[model samples]
Target: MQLTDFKALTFDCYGTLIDWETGIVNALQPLAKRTGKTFTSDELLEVFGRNESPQQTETPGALYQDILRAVYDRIAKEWGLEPDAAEREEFGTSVKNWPAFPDTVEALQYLKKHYKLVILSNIDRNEFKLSNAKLGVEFDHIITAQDVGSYKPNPNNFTYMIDALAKAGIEKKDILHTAESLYHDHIPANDAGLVSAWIYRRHGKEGYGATHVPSRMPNVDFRFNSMGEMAEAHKQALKG
Candidate 1:
């Protein structure tokens, strides 16, 4: 019920911590510009949002690195643009260039003081290793699609999280799962009986760009506009 009640904070990285949409927009821009396409950063991401999940669902065994380029290729075909090898390669390796949210590291440092912070991500461990350098904090444990062989919104990721943390002797009730994507993380977190916090990254954005909005909005236990808000809440919860 309170921040202090949770011993571990299991996070969905990317959009929660890293500014993934920015990276996606940057990666897509070169291709769009080359073809005289007129898509806003938000628009390009919105298109990506529509296409990313099917690739995730269809290729359960593909590492996230491959999935990234593959999604971009499909989006290109749908837009009547042909993707050259260079454009595809840029996006495929864009994970390393994604910067964390401006608030992310400071908030994470605060939470780390109170909880064992961990990553439950869809990206490969190698990509996360690159991201971890940008995050500037050492997560207690890191779980990725490469490790679990399935992405989130699939129950297996959560199951693996539950069982893995259990090995560390932490009970299910002591962990809080946090993320920005309802489609990818919150729904599955809720389905697995874990309390989820929505990090609301696109707080004022007009649409779900680069994130697929699930048809059904599952209930979220904690909702905030930023990780800083939750970190501040964690501090207040400490006081009471």
Candidate 2:
């Protein structure tokens, strides 16, 4: 399961490569201020985590944009403010502005020299295009929710990604899936029988069920703290 054995590397874009929580908190700040409530970033993220289960159940057709708006709306209501349409739109805009992790570009550049890199994101193509530019790396392929008309954790989305790669003549066994979220990427990748790499961002401590304790997926070939570490691991894996 060394990195050198993989023909391509597929990445989860949001938390794995970008600082999504930072973008989300920044977007929520204006709303919090208007509602006369204060929130630390961690507090806002806690609200988001709580909202995820209901959001997942509300609609099988939920897009990432709608999910964000729903989470924001729920939080706004809890804080005794109406969720404004303008604020929801602002949140969507904020997603496009999420900064890449400091180590992302350099790591991707190093890895790309040795392996084909691709993006498998639950974002629209328009948003992906904007964020990809911000990320500053050329991927071999970029598959988004817009292309498949569904979100991640959906089997179809994974099927679409696999099919897209197949259309391009790359086999699933040749690709290593790397992501930060067990809920969004790793679980589904495991079900689809693809190799996985869990990127532990340490969003929260272990007691709260936030730590990524790897399991079951033997394809989870490597684990790392940052993209830089992953790049170094990849280099070493390739050498051996």
Q: Which candidate number would show the highest lDDT if scored against the true structure?
A: 1
- lDDT by residue for model 2 (40-101), tens: 66777777667655765423443567777887788788888888889887775677778888
Cα TM-score per model: 0.93, 0.84
* Candidate 1 Cα misplacement greater than 4 A, ranges: none
Candidate 2 residue pairs in clash (backbone atoms < 3 Å): none
**All models: lDDT?**
0.85, 0.77
lDDT of 1 by residue, 1-240 (tens): 666788999999989999999988887777788768688788888788778877766345556767888887988888888888988988889889988899998998888888888899887888888999988789989988767866777799899999999998889999899899889888888889998889999989887777877867989889999999999998887777
Which pairs of residues collide in candidate 1? 45-210
Off by over 4 Å in 2: 35-37, 52-66, 84-86, 203-219, 238-240
Query: How far is 34's C-alpha from truth in model 1 (Å)?
Result: 0.8
